[PDB]
Ligand binder design. Structure first.
Ligand SMILES: Nc1ncnc2c1ncn2[C@@H]1O[C@H](COP(=O)(O)OP(=O)(O)O)[C@@H](O)[C@H]1O
Lengths: 269, 88
């Protein structure tokens, strides 16, 4: 992790970073994970400190040495893809990138189900309703949400039953169910850690949500679906599909729903 | 026509034996009932101050505790050690 390597003195941060790569080779196959990549290897042209520029050169050479260190893969995490020195992105080194982003409503429900595997839920619990309300939340927040719901259910029942000892009866714990009221309370305490970042997901607006505009609905299908549903007809006539359409007219007539509804039927983000 | 309130005058002599009571060693070990009750009251004290509500909702909570009494029993502590009681 960046902060730990940066806490080391000049000469120690470079040696310690190299040792990590040497140990991974000795234990190969191995995976090296570098957290806060933007902290360990910030853009060199942005930092005047000699040590912070040096550690970038040291990481770049260690990454290149992976052609000799057999069966070692280096993974890294950053909060922003543009906060790291672009040299790392050259062929080799970090030439694969995956955008994790923010889970959508379906992903949020899956996370809630995962962190409740061991939890007994009451019949009134509706995790889909929770996932729909938790806008702007990420897995760390949904995990905390389940934890807080567990603690509230435990305080209501178990604190009246449990002993001042190291162990608790298995029957008492197994007989505790977490109700929807405990999730609602936990939702009031939780605060999303990623509310401002743009969320990209398949919209839930369908054609049934739009009154009228029967011809516009068909026009969007011709512009968006036909180029990929019938590509042989576009090639046959030498046509280049349109790249987009502009809507104009009075406000409040459904322009937003039209764009979402076509994305919905196409299952597009 | 209304009945007159009878003072029911009584005088008592306290006995030194009334204050002689020794606790068991386990008296000061808090129970699960006390831990769950007190932990609930701590959360309710924070929630009560945190809730946004009009005066009518505040009156509904306070009003339930206000109406029980319309008589009083008075005592007077006299220099000679006698306890004088009556009804008003
Ligand atoms: N054709 C329509 N069918 C159903 N609802 C509509 C229609 N046109 C507008 N609305 C309602 O009006 C609101 C505003 O639509 P929107 O396209 O967002 O307008 P604007 O983008 O100008 O603010 C929507 O929330 C929708 O509920």
């Amino acid at each position: 992790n960046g902060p730990e390597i940066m806490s080391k003195l000049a000469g120690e941060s470079e040696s310690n970073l190299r040792k990590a790569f040497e140990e991974a080779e000795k234990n190969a196959p191995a995976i090296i994970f570098i957290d806060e990549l933007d902290a360990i290897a910030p853009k060199r042209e942005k930092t005047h400190g000699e040590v912070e520029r040096r550690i970038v050169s040291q990481l770049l050479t260690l990454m290149d040495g992976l052609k000799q260190r057999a069966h070692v893969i280096v993974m890294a995490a950053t909060n922003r893809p543009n906060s790291i020195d672009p040299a790392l992105r050259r062929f080799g080194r970090f030439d694969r990138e995956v955008d994790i982003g923010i889970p959508d409503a379906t992903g949020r429900l899956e996370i809630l189900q995962i962190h409740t595997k061991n939890m007994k839920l009451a019949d009134d619990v509706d995790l889909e309703q929770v996932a729909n309300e938790t806008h702007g939340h990420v897995g760390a927040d949904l995990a905390a949400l389940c934890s807080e719901a567990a603690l509230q259910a435990i305080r209501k029942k178990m604190d009246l039953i449990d002993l001042e000892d190291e162990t608790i009866d298995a029957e008492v714990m197994n007989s505790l169910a977490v109700t929807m009221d405990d999730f609602r309370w936990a939702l009031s305490q939780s605060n999303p850690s990623a509310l401002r970042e743009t969320v990209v997901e398949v919209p839930q607006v369908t054609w049934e949500d739009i009154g009228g505009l029967e011809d516009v609905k068909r026009e969007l299908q011709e512009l968006v679906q036909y180029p990929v549903e019938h590509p042989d007809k576009f090639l046959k006539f030498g046509m280049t599909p349109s790249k987009g359409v502009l809507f104009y007219g009075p406000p409040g007539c459904g322009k937003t729903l039209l764009a979402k509804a076509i994305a919905n039927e196409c299952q597009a983000n | 026509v209304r009945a007159k309130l009878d003072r029911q005058r009584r005088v008592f002599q306290p006995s030194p034996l009334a204050s002689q009571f020794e606790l068991p060693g386990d008296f000061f070990n808090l129970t699960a009932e006390e831990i769950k009750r007190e932990q609930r009251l701590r959360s309710e004290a924070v929630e009560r101050l945190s809730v946004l509500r009009t005066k009518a909702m505040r009156e509904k909570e306070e009003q339930r505790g206000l109406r029980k009494y319309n008589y009083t029993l008075l005592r007077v502590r006299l220099p000679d050690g006698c306890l004088l009681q009556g009804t008003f």
